[PDB]
Paper text:
As we previously demonstrated, microglia are critically dependent on CSF1R signaling for their survival, and we set out to develop specific CSF1R inhibitors that were orally bioavailable, brain-penetrant, and able to achieve robust brain-wide microglia elimination for extended periods of time. Of note, loss of function mutations in the tyrosine kinase domain of the Csf1r are associated with the development of adult-onset leukoencephalopathy with axonal spheroids and pigmented glia, the onset of which is thought to derive from microglial phenotypic alterations. To that end, we designed, synthesized, and optimized a potent, specific, orally bioavailable, and brain-penetrant CSF1R inhibitor, PLX5622, to deplete microglia for > 6 months in 5xFAD mice.
Using a structure-guided drug design strategy based on the existing CSF1R/KIT/FLT3 inhibitor PLX339710,18, combined with in vivo screening for optimal PK, brain penetrance, and microglial depletion, we created PLX5622, with crystallography revealing the interactions between PLX5622 and the CSF1R. Cell free kinase inhibitor profiling revealed that PLX5622 is highly specific for the CSF1R, showing > 20-fold selectivity over KIT and FLT3, the two most homologous receptors. Two key structural differences between PLX5622 and PLX3397 contribute to the improved selectivity based on crystallographic analysis. First, the 2-fluoro substitution on the middle pyridine ring of PLX5622 is designed to access the CSF1R-unique space next to Gly-795 (a gate-keeper to the interior allosteric pocket); both KIT and FLT3 have a bulkier cysteine at the equivalent position. Anchored on both ends by hydrogen bonds and hydrophobic packing, PLX5622 has the fluorine atom at a fixed position. As van der Waals repulsion increases in proportion to the 6th power of the distance between two atoms, a larger gate keeper residue (as seen in KIT and FLT3) will likely incur an energetic penalty for the steric hindrance. Second, the terminal pyridine group of PLX5622 is optimized to stabilize the allosteric pocket of CSF1R vacated by the displaced juxtamembrane domain.
Numbering used by the authors: 566 to 688, 747 to 915
């Protein structure tokens, strides 16, 4: 990624952004909503999400932001990913301008939505099964696009899916703008904080990441969707027993709102042999057909 070249076609004048509230923050980074004036070929004026370093960041974090910018440019645009809209690299700190997604991350959306649906009994518009299938197929479409570019995401999870206008799902990555240090979904495994409960066995044990390991993580995401935002392996501590169980083929039980169909997809994503797992295109075609 560092050898990749940054194309100035993305360059945008930083004085043409008016910043609003912070959308998310990590230790050394954050994403901030902004209005951009004159953005793009149509000179649009619109709300954007700007990723930038915090004052706590150092050179290593700057290099990672620039690398992310180079990767987003190289990837190309797709309806079901968080697209790059421009960047500010001259005359100040690096700014990465991405699409703003009004409904926020999918995980929180499902949890708040489930609470809203249960409110009448205990005190707009409820979710339907078809919505869950749409979210699932949209994310699989976006993952099929990344896989077609041989791009490995490595942190597929509902917290990294964003919902835009029309409640269209987009796979993104909060990255530096996530507080992983204080986030119980990231486990201290040796040197780094890793989303172990989402990770394929070969990534945990052999440090191997592929499109097929993303497929596994996508199956965990499917479980999050069709449980309306439960934590995976709920109540189970990540320890030696957990690692062994995963390696031996232990799998989560069927989620409450998953049709047998969809749970079977999950199981296929969790095949121990990575080549046996479905491809994102197979998942997409099946889920599109199911969402009709
Ligand atoms: C496949 O995606 C990628 N792959 C590799 C990469 F290196 C980067 C990406 C996508 N980069 C990115 C940037 C910012 C954000 C946060 C974000 C954007 N819009 C929002 N609207 C609302 C809220 C609450 C948050 C946001 C996000 F999710 N992803």
């Amino acid at each position: 990624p560092t050898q990749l070249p940054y194309n100035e076609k993305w360059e945008f004048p930083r004085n043409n952004l008016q910043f609003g509230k912070t959308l998310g923050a990590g230790a050394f980074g954050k994403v901030v909503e902004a209005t951009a004036f004159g953005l793009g070929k149509e000179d649009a004026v619109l709300k954007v999400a700007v990723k930038m370093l915090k004052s706590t960041a150092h050179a290593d974090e700057k290099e990672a932001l620039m690398s992310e910018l180079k990767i987003m440019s190289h990837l190309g645009q797709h309806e079901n990913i968080v697209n790059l809209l421009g960047a500010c690299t001259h005359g100040g700190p690096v700014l990465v301008i991405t699409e703003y997604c009004t409904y926020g991350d999918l995980l929180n959306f499902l949890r708040r939505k489930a609470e809203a649906m249960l409110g009448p009994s205990l005190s707009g518009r409820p979710l339907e099964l078809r919505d869950l299938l749409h979210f699932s197929s949209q994310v699989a479409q976006g993952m099929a696009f990344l896989a077609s570019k041989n791009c490995i995401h490595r942190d597929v999870a509902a917290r990294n899916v964003l919902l835009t206008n029309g409640h269209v799902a987009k796979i993104g990555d909060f990255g530096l703008a996530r507080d992983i240090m204080n986030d119980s979904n990231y486990i201290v495994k040796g040197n780094a904080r890793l989303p172990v409960k989402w990770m394929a066995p070969e990534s945990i044990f052999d440090s191997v990441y592929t499109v097929q390991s993303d497929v596994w993580s996508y199956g965990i995401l499917l479980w999050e969707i069709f449980s309306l935002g439960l934590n995976p392996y709920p109540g189970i501590l990540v320890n030696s027993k957990f690692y062994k169980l995963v390696k031996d083929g232990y799998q989560m039980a069927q989620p409450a709102f998953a049709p047998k169909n969809i749970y079977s997809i999950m199981q296929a994503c969790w095949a121990l042999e990575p080549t046996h797992r479905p491809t994102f295109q197979q998942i997409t075609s099946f889920l599109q057909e199911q969402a009709q």
